[PDB]
Paper text:
Pyruvate kinase (PYK) is the last enzyme in this pathway that catalyzes the production of pyruvate from phosphoenolpyruvate (PEP) and plays a crucial role in controlling carbon flux; however, while S. pneumoniae PYK (SpPYK) is indispensable for growth, surprisingly little is known about its functional properties. The overall structure of SpPYK, which consists of four protomers with three domains, shares the structural organization of archetypal PYKs. PYKs require divalent cations for activity, and they are either K+-dependent or K+-independent depending on the active site residue being a Glu or Lys, respectively. This residue is Glu93 in SpPYK, and we found that both Mg2+ and K+ are necessary for the proper function of SpPYK. In contrast, only a modest activation effect was observed upon G6P addition, and the kinetic profile remained sigmoidal. These results demonstrate that FBP is the primary allosteric activator of SpPYK.
To obtain SpPYK structures in different conformations, we conducted vapor diffusion crystallization trials with FBP and PEP as well as the enolpyruvate analog oxalate that has previously been used for PYK crystallization studies. The bound PEP or oxalate is seen in the catalytic site located at the pocket flanked by A and B domains, and FBP is found at the effector binding site in the C domain located ∼35 Å away from the catalytic site. Upon FBP binding, the effector loop (Ala482...Thr492) swings outward and destabilizes the Thr455-Asp456 interaction. This interface rearrangement is accompanied by the formation of new side-chain interactions including hydrogen bonds between Ser389 and Asp393. In SpPYK, the C1 phosphate is located at the effector site pocket and forms hydrogen bonds with semi-conserved threonine residues (Thr407, Thr409, and Thr412) located in the short loop region preceding the Cα2 helix. The fructose ring and the C6 phosphate point toward the C-C interface, with the latter making contacts with polar residues at the N-terminal end of the Cα1 helix (Ser382 and Thr384) as well as His411 in the short loop region and Arg491 on the effector loop. We show that the FBP C6 phosphate in SpPYK does not occupy the same space as the FBP C1 phosphate in M2PYK, but instead positions itself where it interacts with polar residues close to the C-C interface.
Author numbering:
A (entry chain C), B (entry chain D), C (entry chain A), D (entry chain B): 1 to 501
Write the structure that this text describes.
Amino acid sequence: MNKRVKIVATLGPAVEIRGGKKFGEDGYWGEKLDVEASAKNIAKLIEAGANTFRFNFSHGDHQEQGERMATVKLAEKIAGKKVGFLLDTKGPEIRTELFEGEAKEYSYKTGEKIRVATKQGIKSTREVIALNVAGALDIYDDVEVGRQVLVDDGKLGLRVVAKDDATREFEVEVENDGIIAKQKGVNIPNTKIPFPALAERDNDDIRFGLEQGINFIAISFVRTAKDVNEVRAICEETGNGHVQLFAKIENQQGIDNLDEIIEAADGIMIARGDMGIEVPFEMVPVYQKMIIKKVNAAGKVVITATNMLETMTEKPRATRSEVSDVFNAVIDGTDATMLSGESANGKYPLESVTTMATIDKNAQALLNEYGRLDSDSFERNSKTEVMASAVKDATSSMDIKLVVTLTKTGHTARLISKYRPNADILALTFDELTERGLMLNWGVIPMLTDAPSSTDDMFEIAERKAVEAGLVESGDDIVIVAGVPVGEAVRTNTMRIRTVR
Amino acid sequence: MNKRVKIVATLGPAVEIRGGKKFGEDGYWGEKLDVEASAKNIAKLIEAGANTFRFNFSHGDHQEQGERMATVKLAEKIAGKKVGFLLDTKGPEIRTELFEGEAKEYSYKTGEKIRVATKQGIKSTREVIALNVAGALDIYDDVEVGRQVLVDDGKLGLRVVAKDDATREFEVEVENDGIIAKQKGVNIPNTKIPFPALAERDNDDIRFGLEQGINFIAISFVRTAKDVNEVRAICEETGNGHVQLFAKIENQQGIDNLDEIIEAADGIMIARGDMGIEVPFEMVPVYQKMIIKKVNAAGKVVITATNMLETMTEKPRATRSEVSDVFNAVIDGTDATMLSGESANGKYPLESVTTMATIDKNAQALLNEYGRLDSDSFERNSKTEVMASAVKDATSSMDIKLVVTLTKTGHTARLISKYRPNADILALTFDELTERGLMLNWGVIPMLTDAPSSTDDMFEIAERKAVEAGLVESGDDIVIVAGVPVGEAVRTNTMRIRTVR
Amino acid sequence: MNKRVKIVATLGPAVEIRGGKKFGEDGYWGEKLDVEASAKNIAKLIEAGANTFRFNFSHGDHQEQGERMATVKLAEKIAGKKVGFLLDTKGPEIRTELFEGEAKEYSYKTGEKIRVATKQGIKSTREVIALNVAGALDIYDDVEVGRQVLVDDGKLGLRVVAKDDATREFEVEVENDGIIAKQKGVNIPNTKIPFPALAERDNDDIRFGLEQGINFIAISFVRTAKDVNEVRAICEETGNGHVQLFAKIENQQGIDNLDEIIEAADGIMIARGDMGIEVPFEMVPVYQKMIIKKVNAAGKVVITATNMLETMTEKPRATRSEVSDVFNAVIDGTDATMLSGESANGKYPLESVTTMATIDKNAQALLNEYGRLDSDSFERNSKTEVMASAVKDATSSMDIKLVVTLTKTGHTARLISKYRPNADILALTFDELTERGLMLNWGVIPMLTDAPSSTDDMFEIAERKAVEAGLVESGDDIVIVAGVPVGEAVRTNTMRIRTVR
Amino acid sequence: MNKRVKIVATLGPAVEIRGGKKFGEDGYWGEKLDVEASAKNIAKLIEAGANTFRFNFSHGDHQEQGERMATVKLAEKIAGKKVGFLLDTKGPEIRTELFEGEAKEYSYKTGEKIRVATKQGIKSTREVIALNVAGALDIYDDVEVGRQVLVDDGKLGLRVVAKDDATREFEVEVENDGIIAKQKGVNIPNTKIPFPALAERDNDDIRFGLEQGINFIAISFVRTAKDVNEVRAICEETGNGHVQLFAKIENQQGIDNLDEIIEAADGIMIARGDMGIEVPFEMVPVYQKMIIKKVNAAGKVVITATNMLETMTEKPRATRSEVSDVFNAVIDGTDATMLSGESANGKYPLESVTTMATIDKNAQALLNEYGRLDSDSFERNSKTEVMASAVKDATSSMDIKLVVTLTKTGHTARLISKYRPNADILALTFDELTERGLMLNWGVIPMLTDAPSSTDDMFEIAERKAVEAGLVESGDDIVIVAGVPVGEAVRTNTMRIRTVR
Ligand SMILES: O=P(O)(O)OC[C@H]1O[C@](O)(COP(=O)(O)O)[C@@H](O)[C@@H]1O
Ligand SMILES: O=P(O)(O)OC[C@H]1O[C@](O)(COP(=O)(O)O)[C@@H](O)[C@@H]1O
Ligand SMILES: [K+]
Ligand SMILES: [K+]
Ligand SMILES: [Mg+2]
Ligand SMILES: [Mg+2]
């Protein structure tokens, strides 16, 4: 059986050999990057079923992200399998400042009255916590009494009980025992801090990514369609119109504007890390199931992200809760599941990919029984979608090992994928931009082929490439879909059921 | 908008012209049969929607039947449209004898005690009714006390109160007021009277029919699968393997043996006349729905028969219950509705066909909302059946004016029909046996075409035959199914969605 | 066991003996009504399953209708069973006049040109048909060129091809061969002849009927809510607020206003006779199913009317199409089936009721498998309604022989009836108006009892009434519903499942 | 918003105070158990939503288990709220022995060849790992070449490559890098070590548990119905027939015998820790959903256990994974969710219970929209069950705040619970065994009350207990169910819908 749900793996030092040293040994950050040895490691993640690599520009400067992307291009040749290239923007960040006298952190206790300063370019004291806000924005006027300020992935919460106009300081009450360390992520849920739709840092990060060559951008903290439209404009300008934009939904505002965001984007990344701090943590599974249904209904890509195999960062086995989360994300109808720290900076990047692949492959076999998505409810809004519906029906009527589509732009493949047939989908395309562009769509196995000439038998070509890929053997039944004849046919218009000889 | 539900019309004097006179006109029986004028009159039934003519061998001799069949063959050429040919057998029958003294009938009152004689060759008296039993069988040992003897379309009931061994007479009580006339039909419900599986006279009737050229045999009072298999043996013996056998379910035994009768036959005629006398009348609607569903699930033809527009025998307008009966037969899922005395012996044969066609045409538009058949429940047991399922799916996703199948034996057109698509089925076939064999399948418009050569584009032929037939025009979307390419393809294996040029 | 679908039987001269004479005999109408022999005939229809008698004010004067009502009152005492009393208005009928020269009828041929007169109080000639318009209305201005005048149950069509202002005659073309006889019903479909919302003669007939004692009024040709509201005002102002109104839907305007008619009425009579003339005959089965669903969703009574066993007017047995019609009306979800000429004028009134009761009883056993009504879909809009839903659930979960409700006004009985439980409904009420008012609700067996004391065990009273009615025996499981306790309870608020001692 | 999903919290040192020190603090184990301060910690778990305490007989002697049970009996009096008492057996555990020279652990690399001894009562060396097998059983004959020995929650794999018959030692190959620490769990999947159906240690522990007073026994590693029936015999033999048995399904054999184990047991604990080691980890979510469905269909209790908020052992926040796992367990249909190490040995026992209670409470609001259980499919096999079905129908038809049942044994409450009504269930019972007996049934709020007299209004009692309990206010709608009248009723036979005054 082939794996239909796609894997995004984040790259970091965990895979990268430096002068024979594995990550986090004595001296490691001294030695020179070992490019062949690293690439051999990354080629193992590809063979274990990583379909796209995520380059997280929250961490590591341009040269490091340049070097990692080039190491991946090497690994593609060692594996003999191509992968997608996804850039993840930094976006708006609030961090806690340095402390007076280079103190790393302080410990607080429930009931404690302290203050949070809004003045920029100062240091924190134990008593007065200062913020490093992207663009040095003043946030005093943006947050009201009763709002919460949450420090370090939401581990410590401060309730704003009052506002001091003379100092521009929040009077806060500590809500639980915990630590405030320096240069730690701060969230302020249910506030509209006027960060730009697209910051200048993220503009430059994107333009460099587009230069090196990428297939996808995931845009952090998308709040309105404007955040997506402005990234789109740049993709257009530089002739990178092939690039697909996933909005990262991370906060209440993003969730409020989700319908317009989906309309503007090619896909949604469900960024549960932030979203779980920014909205009631118990609501995240509600939003997860709703988002997946709405994006699938739009024929777009949905990625479920963050903590999927979290304990595998430090321990060799996933917990029962983590296997359950990966399985249920498949059953909910996700196109893709993602690894962050587990692949980027953990002790078990390869085992983490193998584990997610094993769960994902198992879960796809339960989609008939338990799948939340319902393709019978969709309006078939074009003739290609009608063909996709009929392909679904054939794969429901009898045992179809494979669907094969000859697809110029990938449109047929995306509509077949949308209907979630009980078969793998071989997308035969004629250019690498379409090929890589398809690597996160559920079920789709993109494969490069010569454009069929008017004398070619498209059906013989489809059967032959399917046998070449080892996907089917003698006696297997396959469905082939194509625009027949080539030149005359305006769209996919023909379906054949073919016994493989 | 074409009529999907097929009409069977029974031929008789009502459509024959004698010396420029219609049936019922003064002098009619004193004029000679006008063959051409009759053929032109029958041509009007073809144009109005008759798809098959029934030749009832219960009435008239071989000479009369043979000449009716020859006159329909003329009518086909005048209308420019072919129809099926159906022989309906005499089968097991009991009639009241002639009365001593050339008396016509007597009248009887409830509770009156009389006798029914079983001795063959005798005349009836007022107090002693003699039976003409088919093949002069002695029925005395096969009817128990408490059984009922019903005379003339079930109008008069006689309870068997005792058996007189010396006279071989039944002592009977008159259960209701009514008349006994000579040569009227007698039923004895829930007896196993040992009429042969195939009587000699039905053997000879079927041979005569097979010599004339027929597409269908309706076997009267099928009691077991043996009744069907013995007719099949003659069809096989004579090289008439193409002839489809419809079992007429008319009594309790046929209903007990329904599953084995359906397996052995090509279809069922729901013969409601005898059925509603031979089982409790109020159960006939139950048996009708059940049979339609079982036959449809087997991919076979079901004909709903008898009294559907009964009043139009004598009146120009159908009753409200008659329009309701024809409508509800369509919703039940009937392939065909039948006219008996309405077309054969009535004053308004053309109006009867037209009325039936108008009802059938309107009821077909309500099969989506009210239809009792459920194609989603069927096992697709072959590749031609999964193609039929996918055509049904395409006709549910978008407006398809027509499904075109190129079919060698009609097998693809039978399976498309079974799934009751939201479109007309144009069955392009290569011989006239196949063509006329399809004329009672729901939705199917059979049409003769030259066998395509491996040079011929079947999708162009399909489109051109449909434009030439008047069925589609520019802008209409059609589904085309075929075994591509001719030579290699072992079955129907391809579907195209095509906008007609 | 008990017949849940109600029968309305039309009373006419078929059951009425007058000075030893029967309908058709010379001097019949001059002889005095033999009230006792007539009541014994009617008592037989009551025993055979008639639940309500219809008095058709289209035929016979006030005295005739008055004597016929008094004879049913006597028949109730002979049968020992009460029935409802339904008055059916004449309404805006048009009829062909008497001819000159005492002529009964004339023959006409397709293409013949004749005239229809609009002038009132004159006589038809062969060439000039005169119309007897209800209220002597002048229709000349309300029927345009291109309309159709239909004579005699829709049997002869006349196309208005011109209008002569000098004589105020329609110039018509005979559309088909047939007969214009005297006093035959005329319809002019798709016209708004401005007959008043309530004519003086219908006003007078209703008032006469209210004075005699009636439960129901069926209002002929309801076009708007106004037609119902005008009869409502009269029932209310005379102290007859208990009288229930059934709108007869007989024409296109009635169908166009169906939803506000149902709101304003207590029920609908599906008057198929005129409806099948006034709209395309093939649409009637469509409107019947839709009407029955809508009326049942409002908790109101639907009567399926006209031609149900038509041929039993003249012949001893129903056709197979007639049995199918009554069976399919039950499965559609009708509360009540109706007889007109079959019971009012025919040769076989007792046998027609018996036949209809046998069909209804059988058909009820198939409502769980085939029944078109879906109670699971309704909004439960009150707590009496949620209790009726819970009763329906108990009768679905186990074998419940009987549902008993103690109901002051019949509201709880109506709502249980709406949900169509798999059980008979014993409605114990405390006055005869309510008791007779429940006689047409599906499943309801109404029965008189004293208003229970706040002393009384209502669940014991219910069991005892059920044993006294012969409905249950020792071992049977019954559902009892009541407002507990009396005085404190504002509504039905209790359900008990009890095993009969 | 009452929490309908029940919480099982495992007791351990995490909640125990010893001379003013919390668990983990310097010198903790030196100080003595402070019973009052421990009981006050435990009362806070009770207030936050813990419904039953698990006493895990895998860890601590009888003296420690007994003290802990007495402390919870104090906590119930401080909380003002009763809780269930669940004993969890040791069962057939294997552990790594102590090392020679008191060495704590050793590290191994992939491909190392070592030995595992079967000899009982000796210490391990690096090269020869010794096993503490439950009951000192010799496992040498039970594990074949090619089997896997896994150490410490499945973290390190040892493949058996050969067996030395002389020393009765396994030759094993290290399959992955990791640690063998002393006294860690060992698993040998897909073997059948002949552990007795009931080991003497588990017999003794259960008998100690029954003498102290328990409501529930969770039987570890149930392989067959016989493992349950042996504990059942002890419960009955000792007067403890009320005690409920949960089979823990933890290996392949229990899964293979699931249907038989469910028949013999009162419920299932889905013991995902051992299950995910003993069967393919990716299959665990499959078995979970299936178990929940079958157990619910049986009207029994299902507890979903292990790793549910794992990270909250060491960190203040749950991962997105863990929230997703608890939420999906609720949607699957679990009666109860469990905390093990998170409540027994973690830093945040209270915040763990609080967190789970928040997820569980939010998830129940979505069971209507997303719930996998379907009560419509159940056969109602008894009159109580039909009453449960009607209750469910009323809670779906309108807004019912509370279902009240007066239940002597808890049968009516268990069946109402089984049907998952959209309301809390107040179970008023008359003894403490039934009260505590019901604390793991979904939705059930057990409450001790006086047995109603012959004179009492049970519907007044129901309303009044519900108001006193703070569960309903004026104008709320409730559903009350009872066997009325008291002393006459043989079962629940009455449902009332009452507005709180
Ligand atoms: O797919 P199925 O049901 O096995 O049927 C395949 C058979 O039908 C046929 O295709 C006949 O089909 P048509 O008569 O429709 O052309 C045969 O060639 C073949 O043997
Ligand atoms: O529950 P609903 O639909 O509000 O109806 C309540 C009304 O029904 C009644 O209970 C009448 O019911 P019955 O006639 O069935 O006893 C009135 O007392 C009350 O006003
Ligand atoms: K015949
Ligand atoms: K009338
Ligand atoms: Mg017959
Ligand atoms: Mg365990």
